[PDB]
Amino acid sequence: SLNIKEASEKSGVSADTIRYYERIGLIPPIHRNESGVRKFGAEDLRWILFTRQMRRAGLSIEALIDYLALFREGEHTLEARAELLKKQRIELKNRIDVMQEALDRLDFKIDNYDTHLIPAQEELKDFNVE
Amino acid sequence: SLNIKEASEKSGVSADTIRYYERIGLIPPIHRNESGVRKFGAEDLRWILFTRQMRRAGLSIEALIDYLALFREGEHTLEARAELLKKQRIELKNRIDVMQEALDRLDFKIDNYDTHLIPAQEELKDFNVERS
Numbered sequence: 665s666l667n668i669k670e671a672s673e674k675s676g677v678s679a680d681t682i683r684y685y686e687r688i689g690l691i692p693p694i695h696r697n698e699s700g701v702r703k704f705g706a707e708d709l710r711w712i713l714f715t716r717q718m719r720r721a722g723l724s725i726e727a728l729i730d731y732l733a734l735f736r737e738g739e740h741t742l743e744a745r746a747e748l749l750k751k752q753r754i755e756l757k758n759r760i761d762v763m764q765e766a767l768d769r770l771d772f773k774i775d776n777y778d779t780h781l782i783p784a785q786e787e788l789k790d791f792n793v794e
Numbered sequence: 795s796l797n798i799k800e801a802s803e804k805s806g807v808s809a810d811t812i813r814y815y816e817r818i819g820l821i822p823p824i825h826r827n828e829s830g831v832r833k834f835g836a837e838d839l840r841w842i843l844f845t846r847q848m849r850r851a852g853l854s855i856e857a858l859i860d861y862l863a864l865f866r867e868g869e870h871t872l873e874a875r876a877e878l879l880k881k882q883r884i885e886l887k888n889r890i891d892v893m894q895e896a897l898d899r900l901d902f903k904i905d906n907y908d909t910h911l912i913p914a915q916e917e918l919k920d921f922n923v924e925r926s
């Protein structure tokens with residue numbers, strides 16, 4: 665198993681972020697060895713990586729906290745977990761759709777520079793009139 | 795002409811957000827009337843709308859300020875403006891692709907629940923009624 669410094673280097677998540685994840689219930693409680701120190705197993709690293717990934721994708725701490733809490737309650741929460749993730753999925757896909765509309769807008773503007781504005785050496789206003 | 799209240803309503807952007815965009819150079823300076831109040835035209839609204847959409851997509855405030863600055867400088871900056879947009883495009887595409895990775899991960903986990911874990915639980919409940 666890994667100590668926290670090793671877990672940080674492996675996950676690309678800072679040691680203090682890992683401490684925070686555990687304290688507020690984003691990742692399961694971590695084993696403490698005889699000397700009082702955290703020792704991280706494979707499933708701990710998987711929770712760390714999942715948290716890092718979902719947070720960077722915009723899922724809130726509060727949803728992720730709820731999901732781990734249901735997970736720790738065991739099999740009687742399977743249906744509530746599938747539902748929670750399905751709600752997060754729709755929200756995420758909506759965020760993706762928003763971002764893609766902006767990328768499409770940027771692509772249109774860039775095509776306009778490449779195809780029209782730069783060859784004419786004209787601003788869009790200029791060019792539109794002609 | 796629109797006033798700021800009209801421009802805020804039409805653009806879906808708060809009046810204080812509009813004032814902030816002008817103040818820091820995200821949108822071009824707005825014409826003032828004889829009273830000193832702002833009067834908005836169509837290109838103003840087009841800039842407010844572009845700014846809002848781009849900021850919401852995470853384009854940096856500093857990139858958008860540079861883009862307007864180039865625009866205001868004139869025709870000689872056209873190539874530099876396309877390069878700026880192209881750089882922002884790459885970075886936005888990368889952000890989207892990372893979000894899509896996360897979505898694929900949620901779908902995988904959701905398929906495991908709906909395909910495997912829940913019907914497994916359901917099958918056991920049936921076994922237990924049809925054995926009782």
Ligand code: MED
Nearest residue numbers: 710711714735903906907
């Ligand atoms: C470390 S996240 C694992 C997610 C798990 N609860 C599942 O059933 O797919």
Ligand code: NA
Nearest residue numbers: 665666667703
């Ligand atoms: Na070890």
